Amino acid sequence: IESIANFSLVKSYSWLLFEASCMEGQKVLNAIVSKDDVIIPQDVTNSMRQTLAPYAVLSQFYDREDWGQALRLLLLLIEFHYLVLLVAKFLYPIFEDSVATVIEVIETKWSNLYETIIEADKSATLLKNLRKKLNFKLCQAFM
Amino acid sequence: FQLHDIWKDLLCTFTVPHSAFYYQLSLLFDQEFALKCISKSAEYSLQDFKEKQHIHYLNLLIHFEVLDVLRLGHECRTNFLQLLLQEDIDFFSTLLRLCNAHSDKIVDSILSQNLRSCFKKLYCFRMLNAAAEVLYQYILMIRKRKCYLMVINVLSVTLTDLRDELRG
């Protein structure tokens, strides 16, 4: 882990980014040293993505901020299967127009590792996703 | 008065002898006392009398929940209710939303008819929870993208067509 941290060719960097994302989802000095960043997220690329993820986690730890974070997450998923599943899991836990649009785009975008991740999260996925989408739509209608 | 048990109205009330009294007081102060008494009597009682009481109560509450109560009461004079709902149409919408949230025949039909008489589509869709999709498609025949997106979200053949249209 330390060697990989020291190293941080394109595929390897992408893998490192994915690992960092997984670690952030699970949740020291290197992370602090790592912390313009917002603009890069909207658009080295792996690094920018990881930095965007960290800012999102930070915002999550800190209602509008949560919404901004979720929007960032949806934007990241569009740029990019496991990630989408994690996003859906995050959305279910939280449970206006822009949000609905993002959810729609995600539904439009929607293997073994993903199913394993889903099973780990539960401790069927697509159905739960559709149900959550329906709930969000109802919420938007009520507003 | 309650503990126990203008001249012309008093004479009439005396001839009648609780509902008549509260009705008379309500009419006389027509205000807080009036509304309170009328509401109390209406509650204690629960074709003409019922309707009058309901209308009075609804008006008083809207001047000062009551809508849904009165509606469910009368359901269990249709054109009258149509006129009442006509007067109701933002607060009415909120109340309707609350009722729908609580639930999760004639009333539904009257409601649909009134809503059919952006905003309109949203109201209709919220109430029905197919007509929404039809209305949207008819209107479509930035705006395009929004309409297509809304339809796609609602459905989740049509999706592929919408996607192809947006891509073209």
Q: What is the DSSP string of B76-145?
A: --HHHHHHHHHHH--HHHHHHHHHHHHH--HHHHHHHHHHH--HHHHHHHHHH--HHHHHHHHHH--HHH
Touching A: B residues 87-116, CB under 8 Å: 97, 101
Method for this entry: X-ray
φ, ψ at A37 (rounded to 5°)? -65, -35
B126/A130 Cβ within 8 A? no
**What is the rounded distance in angstroms from the CA atom of residue A51 to the CA atom of residue B97?**
42
A7: its two tokens: 């190293």
- B-chain CB neighbours of A141 within 8 Å are 122, 125-126, 129
* CB contact A131 to B (< 8 Å): no
SS (H, E, C) A14-83: HHHHHHHHHHHHHCCHHHHHHCCCCHHHHCCHHHHHHHHHHHHHHHHHCCHHHHHHHHHHHHHHHHCCHH
* CB contact A99 to B (< 8 Å): no
Query: Minimal CA–CA distance to A53: which of A19, A103, A2?
Result: A19
**What is the rounded distance in angstroms from the CA atom of residue B115 to the CA atom of residue B82?**
11
Query: Minimal CA–CA distance to A95: which of A128, A125, A51, A56?
Result: A128
Q: Which amino acid would we find at residue B13?
A: T
- B-chain CB neighbours of A104 within 8 Å are 149, 152-153, 156
**CB nearest to A142's CB, from B97, B156, B159:** B97
Query: Minimal CA–CA distance to A3: which of A30, A26, A22, A23?
Result: A30
B153/A103 Cβ within 8 A? yes
Report the residue of chain A nearest B160, measured CA to CA.
A108
Phi-psi region of B13 (alpha: psi -120 to 50; beta: other; left: phi over 0): alpha
From A40's Cα to the closest Cα of chain B, the distance in A is 26
The 8 Å CB, 24+ separation contacts for B41-46 are: B44/B18, B44/B19, B45/B19, B46/B73
- Do residues A86 and A117 make contact, with C-beta atoms less than 8 angstroms apart? yes
- Do residues B18 and B44 make contact, with C-beta atoms less than 8 angstroms apart? yes
